[PDB]
PDB file of C-alpha atoms in Angstrom:
ATOM      1  CA  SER A   1      82.402 120.623  96.681  1.00  0.00           C
ATOM      2  CA  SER A   2      86.084 119.829  95.621  1.00  0.00           C
ATOM      3  CA  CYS A   3      87.718 117.559  98.291  1.00  0.00           C
ATOM      4  CA  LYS A   4      88.373 118.857 101.426  1.00  0.00           C
ATOM      5  CA  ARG A   5      88.774 118.933 104.932  1.00  0.00           C
ATOM      6  CA  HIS A   6      85.272 118.842 107.376  1.00  0.00           C
ATOM      7  CA  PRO A   7      84.996 119.721 110.785  1.00  0.00           C
ATOM      8  CA  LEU A   8      83.680 116.848 112.541  1.00  0.00           C
ATOM      9  CA  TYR A   9      83.770 116.365 116.298  1.00  0.00           C
ATOM     10  CA  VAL A  10      82.908 112.390 118.401  1.00  0.00           C
ATOM     11  CA  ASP A  11      81.765 111.940 121.007  1.00  0.00           C
ATOM     12  CA  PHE A  12      83.055 108.945 123.273  1.00  0.00           C
ATOM     13  CA  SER A  13      79.361 108.803 124.928  1.00  0.00           C
ATOM     14  CA  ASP A  14      77.362 108.615 121.059  1.00  0.00           C
ATOM     15  CA  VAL A  15      79.695 105.850 120.151  1.00  0.00           C
ATOM     16  CA  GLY A  16      79.321 104.124 123.313  1.00  0.00           C
ATOM     17  CA  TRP A  17      83.188 104.208 123.526  1.00  0.00           C
ATOM     18  CA  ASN A  18      83.195 106.043 127.346  1.00  0.00           C
ATOM     19  CA  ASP A  19      82.764 102.404 128.967  1.00  0.00           C
ATOM     20  CA  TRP A  20      86.450 101.605 128.350  1.00  0.00           C
ATOM     21  CA  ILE A  21      88.166 105.393 127.533  1.00  0.00           C
ATOM     22  CA  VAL A  22      88.565 107.013 131.020  1.00  0.00           C
ATOM     23  CA  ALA A  23      89.826 110.165 128.788  1.00  0.00           C
ATOM     24  CA  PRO A  24      89.837 112.390 126.729  1.00  0.00           C
ATOM     25  CA  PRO A  25      85.657 112.368 126.628  1.00  0.00           C
ATOM     26  CA  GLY A  26      85.870 112.803 122.587  1.00  0.00           C
ATOM     27  CA  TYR A  27      87.763 114.896 120.177  1.00  0.00           C
ATOM     28  CA  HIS A  28      88.435 116.649 116.774  1.00  0.00           C
ATOM     29  CA  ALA A  29      88.630 113.492 114.119  1.00  0.00           C
ATOM     30  CA  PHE A  30      87.884 115.535 111.616  1.00  0.00           C
ATOM     31  CA  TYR A  31      86.689 113.734 108.011  1.00  0.00           C
ATOM     32  CA  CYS A  32      87.220 113.874 104.373  1.00  0.00           C
ATOM     33  CA  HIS A  33      84.405 114.994 101.656  1.00  0.00           C
ATOM     34  CA  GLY A  34      84.416 116.434  98.297  1.00  0.00           C
ATOM     35  CA  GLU A  35      84.551 115.618  94.516  1.00  0.00           C
ATOM     36  CA  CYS A  36      87.715 114.500  92.561  1.00  0.00           C
ATOM     37  CA  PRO A  37      88.336 117.432  90.044  1.00  0.00           C
ATOM     38  CA  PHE A  38      88.392 116.988  86.472  1.00  0.00           C
ATOM     39  CA  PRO A  39      90.611 117.964  84.928  1.00  0.00           C
ATOM     40  CA  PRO A  40      92.972 116.861  87.864  1.00  0.00           C
ATOM     41  CA  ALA A  41      93.488 119.230  90.834  1.00  0.00           C
ATOM     42  CA  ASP A  42      96.849 120.990  90.782  1.00  0.00           C
ATOM     43  CA  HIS A  43      97.810 121.412  95.015  1.00  0.00           C
ATOM     44  CA  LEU A  44      95.849 118.049  95.458  1.00  0.00           C
ATOM     45  CA  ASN A  45      97.708 115.422  96.510  1.00  0.00           C
ATOM     46  CA  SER A  46      96.897 112.227  94.593  1.00  0.00           C
ATOM     47  CA  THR A  47      97.701 109.235  92.956  1.00  0.00           C
ATOM     48  CA  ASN A  48      98.472 108.014  89.496  1.00  0.00           C
ATOM     49  CA  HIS A  49      96.068 105.215  89.759  1.00  0.00           C
ATOM     50  CA  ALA A  50      93.495 108.496  90.991  1.00  0.00           C
ATOM     51  CA  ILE A  51      93.721 110.480  87.900  1.00  0.00           C
ATOM     52  CA  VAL A  52      93.886 107.317  85.643  1.00  0.00           C
ATOM     53  CA  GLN A  53      90.282 106.750  87.400  1.00  0.00           C
ATOM     54  CA  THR A  54      89.377 110.194  87.084  1.00  0.00           C
ATOM     55  CA  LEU A  55      90.256 110.010  83.243  1.00  0.00           C
ATOM     56  CA  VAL A  56      87.789 106.758  82.810  1.00  0.00           C
ATOM     57  CA  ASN A  57      84.977 108.233  84.665  1.00  0.00           C
ATOM     58  CA  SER A  58      84.916 110.907  82.418  1.00  0.00           C
ATOM     59  CA  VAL A  59      84.275 108.841  79.569  1.00  0.00           C
ATOM     60  CA  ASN A  60      82.450 105.751  81.331  1.00  0.00           C
ATOM     61  CA  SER A  61      80.237 106.363  83.828  1.00  0.00           C
ATOM     62  CA  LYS A  62      79.960 103.284  85.233  1.00  0.00           C
ATOM     63  CA  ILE A  63      83.169 103.520  86.829  1.00  0.00           C
ATOM     64  CA  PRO A  64      83.252 105.862  90.161  1.00  0.00           C
ATOM     65  CA  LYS A  65      85.770 108.832  90.452  1.00  0.00           C
ATOM     66  CA  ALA A  66      88.768 108.618  92.541  1.00  0.00           C
ATOM     67  CA  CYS A  67      87.264 108.870  96.452  1.00  0.00           C
ATOM     68  CA  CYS A  68      88.437 111.928  98.850  1.00  0.00           C
ATOM     69  CA  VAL A  69      90.183 110.423 101.942  1.00  0.00           C
ATOM     70  CA  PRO A  70      92.585 111.473 104.910  1.00  0.00           C
ATOM     71  CA  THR A  71      96.193 111.659 103.035  1.00  0.00           C
ATOM     72  CA  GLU A  72      97.725 113.215 106.207  1.00  0.00           C
ATOM     73  CA  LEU A  73      96.545 111.610 110.253  1.00  0.00           C
ATOM     74  CA  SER A  74      97.668 112.575 113.424  1.00  0.00           C
ATOM     75  CA  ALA A  75      97.349 110.874 116.820  1.00  0.00           C
ATOM     76  CA  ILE A  76      96.315 111.739 119.979  1.00  0.00           C
ATOM     77  CA  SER A  77      96.990 110.373 123.131  1.00  0.00           C
ATOM     78  CA  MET A  78      94.234 108.637 125.659  1.00  0.00           C
ATOM     79  CA  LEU A  79      93.839 107.448 128.762  1.00  0.00           C
ATOM     80  CA  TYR A  80      91.825 104.152 129.159  1.00  0.00           C
ATOM     81  CA  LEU A  81      91.341 100.839 130.710  1.00  0.00           C
ATOM     82  CA  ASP A  82      92.312  97.665 129.177  1.00  0.00           C
ATOM     83  CA  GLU A  83      91.272  93.909 129.301  1.00  0.00           C
ATOM     84  CA  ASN A  84      92.538  93.615 133.167  1.00  0.00           C
ATOM     85  CA  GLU A  85      91.114  97.349 134.108  1.00  0.00           C
ATOM     86  CA  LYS A  86      94.375  98.444 134.279  1.00  0.00           C
ATOM     87  CA  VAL A  87      94.786 102.015 133.600  1.00  0.00           C
ATOM     88  CA  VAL A  88      96.672 103.135 130.504  1.00  0.00           C
ATOM     89  CA  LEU A  89      98.324 105.961 128.909  1.00  0.00           C
ATOM     90  CA  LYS A  90      98.813 105.433 125.159  1.00  0.00           C
ATOM     91  CA  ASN A  91      98.756 107.127 121.993  1.00  0.00           C
ATOM     92  CA  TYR A  92      96.604 106.374 119.009  1.00  0.00           C
ATOM     93  CA  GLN A  93      97.634 106.821 115.900  1.00  0.00           C
ATOM     94  CA  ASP A  94      95.875 107.648 112.684  1.00  0.00           C
ATOM     95  CA  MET A  95      93.275 109.313 114.543  1.00  0.00           C
ATOM     96  CA  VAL A  96      92.946 112.892 113.751  1.00  0.00           C
ATOM     97  CA  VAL A  97      92.598 114.150 109.849  1.00  0.00           C
ATOM     98  CA  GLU A  98      94.894 116.574 108.860  1.00  0.00           C
ATOM     99  CA  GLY A  99      94.788 116.483 104.740  1.00  0.00           C
ATOM    100  CA  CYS A 100      92.499 115.066 102.568  1.00  0.00           C
ATOM    101  CA  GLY A 101      93.348 114.015  98.648  1.00  0.00           C
ATOM    102  CA  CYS A 102      92.333 111.393  96.085  1.00  0.00           C
ATOM    103  CA  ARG A 103      93.008 108.030  96.180  1.00  0.00           C
TER     104      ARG A 103
ATOM    105  CA  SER B   1      78.519  94.862  98.106  1.00  0.00           C
ATOM    106  CA  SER B   2      81.287  95.303 100.349  1.00  0.00           C
ATOM    107  CA  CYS B   3      84.559  97.022  99.436  1.00  0.00           C
ATOM    108  CA  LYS B   4      86.271  94.563  97.438  1.00  0.00           C
ATOM    109  CA  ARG B   5      88.400  95.089  94.156  1.00  0.00           C
ATOM    110  CA  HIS B   6      87.066  95.174  90.465  1.00  0.00           C
ATOM    111  CA  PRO B   7      88.387  94.592  87.087  1.00  0.00           C
ATOM    112  CA  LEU B   8      88.731  97.489  84.546  1.00  0.00           C
ATOM    113  CA  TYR B   9      91.207  97.586  81.473  1.00  0.00           C
ATOM    114  CA  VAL B  10      92.252 101.150  80.711  1.00  0.00           C
ATOM    115  CA  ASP B  11      92.691 101.777  76.844  1.00  0.00           C
ATOM    116  CA  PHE B  12      95.316 105.312  76.725  1.00  0.00           C
ATOM    117  CA  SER B  13      93.233 105.939  73.459  1.00  0.00           C
ATOM    118  CA  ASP B  14      90.043 105.645  75.069  1.00  0.00           C
ATOM    119  CA  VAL B  15      91.791 108.398  77.844  1.00  0.00           C
ATOM    120  CA  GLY B  16      93.534 110.255  74.992  1.00  0.00           C
ATOM    121  CA  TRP B  17      97.090 109.399  76.315  1.00  0.00           C
ATOM    122  CA  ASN B  18      98.211 107.733  73.095  1.00  0.00           C
ATOM    123  CA  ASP B  19      99.638 110.746  71.869  1.00  0.00           C
ATOM    124  CA  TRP B  20     102.474 110.185  74.086  1.00  0.00           C
ATOM    125  CA  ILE B  21     102.680 106.673  75.682  1.00  0.00           C
ATOM    126  CA  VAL B  22     104.013 104.139  73.393  1.00  0.00           C
ATOM    127  CA  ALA B  23     103.018 100.932  74.943  1.00  0.00           C
ATOM    128  CA  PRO B  24     101.879  99.205  75.742  1.00  0.00           C
ATOM    129  CA  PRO B  25      98.274 100.089  74.477  1.00  0.00           C
ATOM    130  CA  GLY B  26      96.570  99.719  77.891  1.00  0.00           C
ATOM    131  CA  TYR B  27      96.696  97.918  80.732  1.00  0.00           C
ATOM    132  CA  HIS B  28      94.282  96.061  83.368  1.00  0.00           C
ATOM    133  CA  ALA B  29      94.144  98.913  86.364  1.00  0.00           C
ATOM    134  CA  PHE B  30      91.442  97.656  88.700  1.00  0.00           C
ATOM    135  CA  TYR B  31      89.689  99.759  91.185  1.00  0.00           C
ATOM    136  CA  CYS B  32      88.075  99.916  94.383  1.00  0.00           C
ATOM    137  CA  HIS B  33      84.127  99.571  94.900  1.00  0.00           C
ATOM    138  CA  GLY B  34      82.198  98.649  98.003  1.00  0.00           C
ATOM    139  CA  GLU B  35      80.347  99.406 101.045  1.00  0.00           C
ATOM    140  CA  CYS B  36      83.126  99.790 104.245  1.00  0.00           C
ATOM    141  CA  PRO B  37      81.067  97.542 106.885  1.00  0.00           C
ATOM    142  CA  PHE B  38      79.597  97.865 110.248  1.00  0.00           C
ATOM    143  CA  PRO B  39      80.711  96.297 112.729  1.00  0.00           C
ATOM    144  CA  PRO B  40      83.829  97.248 111.315  1.00  0.00           C
ATOM    145  CA  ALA B  41      85.403  93.607 108.735  1.00  0.00           C
ATOM    146  CA  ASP B  42      87.990  91.359 110.655  1.00  0.00           C
ATOM    147  CA  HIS B  43      90.121  90.486 107.563  1.00  0.00           C
ATOM    148  CA  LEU B  44      89.658  93.829 105.692  1.00  0.00           C
ATOM    149  CA  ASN B  45      92.762  96.795 106.324  1.00  0.00           C
ATOM    150  CA  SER B  46      91.217  99.733 107.519  1.00  0.00           C
ATOM    151  CA  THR B  47      92.366 102.674 110.215  1.00  0.00           C
ATOM    152  CA  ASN B  48      91.280 103.805 113.399  1.00  0.00           C
ATOM    153  CA  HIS B  49      89.655 106.670 111.998  1.00  0.00           C
ATOM    154  CA  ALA B  50      88.278 105.336 109.169  1.00  0.00           C
ATOM    155  CA  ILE B  51      86.723 102.648 112.166  1.00  0.00           C
ATOM    156  CA  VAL B  52      85.538 105.731 113.700  1.00  0.00           C
ATOM    157  CA  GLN B  53      83.954 107.903 111.142  1.00  0.00           C
ATOM    158  CA  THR B  54      81.991 104.479 109.939  1.00  0.00           C
ATOM    159  CA  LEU B  55      80.632 104.232 113.731  1.00  0.00           C
ATOM    160  CA  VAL B  56      79.933 108.075 113.826  1.00  0.00           C
ATOM    161  CA  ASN B  57      77.967 107.387 110.529  1.00  0.00           C
ATOM    162  CA  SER B  58      75.846 104.700 112.264  1.00  0.00           C
ATOM    163  CA  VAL B  59      74.216 107.136 114.138  1.00  0.00           C
ATOM    164  CA  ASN B  60      74.668 110.351 112.546  1.00  0.00           C
ATOM    165  CA  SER B  61      74.505 110.028 109.231  1.00  0.00           C
ATOM    166  CA  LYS B  62      75.173 113.475 107.864  1.00  0.00           C
ATOM    167  CA  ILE B  63      78.356 111.952 108.211  1.00  0.00           C
ATOM    168  CA  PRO B  64      79.736 109.680 105.375  1.00  0.00           C
ATOM    169  CA  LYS B  65      80.632 106.165 106.078  1.00  0.00           C
ATOM    170  CA  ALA B  66      84.621 105.017 105.088  1.00  0.00           C
ATOM    171  CA  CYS B  67      85.586 105.113 101.590  1.00  0.00           C
ATOM    172  CA  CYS B  68      86.763 102.071  99.672  1.00  0.00           C
ATOM    173  CA  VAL B  69      90.173 102.769  98.407  1.00  0.00           C
ATOM    174  CA  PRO B  70      93.397 100.983  96.817  1.00  0.00           C
ATOM    175  CA  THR B  71      95.000 100.209  99.936  1.00  0.00           C
ATOM    176  CA  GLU B  72      97.855  98.076  97.563  1.00  0.00           C
ATOM    177  CA  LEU B  73      99.391  99.617  94.373  1.00  0.00           C
ATOM    178  CA  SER B  74     102.254  98.163  91.805  1.00  0.00           C
ATOM    179  CA  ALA B  75     103.898  99.622  88.764  1.00  0.00           C
ATOM    180  CA  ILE B  76     103.824  99.035  85.680  1.00  0.00           C
ATOM    181  CA  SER B  77     106.318  99.359  82.690  1.00  0.00           C
ATOM    182  CA  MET B  78     105.734 101.992  79.839  1.00  0.00           C
ATOM    183  CA  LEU B  79     107.509 103.551  76.527  1.00  0.00           C
ATOM    184  CA  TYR B  80     106.623 106.796  76.350  1.00  0.00           C
ATOM    185  CA  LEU B  81     107.653 109.904  74.174  1.00  0.00           C
ATOM    186  CA  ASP B  82     108.842 112.562  76.846  1.00  0.00           C
ATOM    187  CA  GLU B  83     108.794 116.810  76.037  1.00  0.00           C
ATOM    188  CA  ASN B  84     111.382 116.642  73.557  1.00  0.00           C
ATOM    189  CA  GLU B  85     110.027 113.547  71.497  1.00  0.00           C
ATOM    190  CA  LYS B  86     112.970 111.300  73.225  1.00  0.00           C
ATOM    191  CA  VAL B  87     111.644 107.680  73.399  1.00  0.00           C
ATOM    192  CA  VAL B  88     112.074 107.008  77.568  1.00  0.00           C
ATOM    193  CA  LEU B  89     111.261 103.185  79.405  1.00  0.00           C
ATOM    194  CA  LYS B  90     110.161 104.287  82.786  1.00  0.00           C
ATOM    195  CA  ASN B  91     108.222 102.331  85.572  1.00  0.00           C
ATOM    196  CA  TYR B  92     105.528 103.949  86.751  1.00  0.00           C
ATOM    197  CA  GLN B  93     104.428 103.591  90.091  1.00  0.00           C
ATOM    198  CA  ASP B  94     100.786 103.237  91.796  1.00  0.00           C
ATOM    199  CA  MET B  95      99.283 102.169  88.424  1.00  0.00           C
ATOM    200  CA  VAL B  96      97.375  99.183  89.352  1.00  0.00           C
ATOM    201  CA  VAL B  97      95.880  97.861  92.251  1.00  0.00           C
ATOM    202  CA  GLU B  98      96.530  95.008  94.463  1.00  0.00           C
ATOM    203  CA  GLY B  99      93.886  95.507  97.325  1.00  0.00           C
ATOM    204  CA  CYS B 100      91.660  98.037  98.948  1.00  0.00           C
ATOM    205  CA  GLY B 101      90.711  98.897 101.814  1.00  0.00           C
ATOM    206  CA  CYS B 102      88.786 101.301 104.092  1.00  0.00           C
ATOM    207  CA  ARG B 103      90.486 104.915 104.652  1.00  0.00           C
TER     208      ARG B 103
END
């Protein structure tokens, strides 16, 4: 199982966020999971350090492989109540995973 | 063990990179490891999605917690031989971990 994007729906109720987030009720946030390959994957986004750590891992194991994380994020708009109970329409950055990579 | 930076010295020999990297012999690359807290840490860099995934994790466990990764990287200069055996002095980006965070 290599580093790839996975489905994930968040219900603001489960996390108890529905007490301040008017709408939406929840959303598709997605998430990243998977093993960072070696030899390093081709069409897979990766930083120099991540490549180096992946190599060090093959020889020494006390050092963990690179981690599969969101490399591309988009936002969602939400209707919520702030500190003074003022309805607010705000765009929230970095909420939805659109791409994963090794870091 | 929370998300923090850890010592790590890379020897270009061990990874068999000394065949093309004239100098340096190796360097302090460091790495990141540690558990991404919950409630979410204060002075710890974190993205909205990482906070949301950490929360979903507390209720559902099939979903992994956020990952501890390099959030700040610096470069090191290296002397190496390219494809035509031409000595080259190049600055290499994203080689040294200067800060970790949850993503």
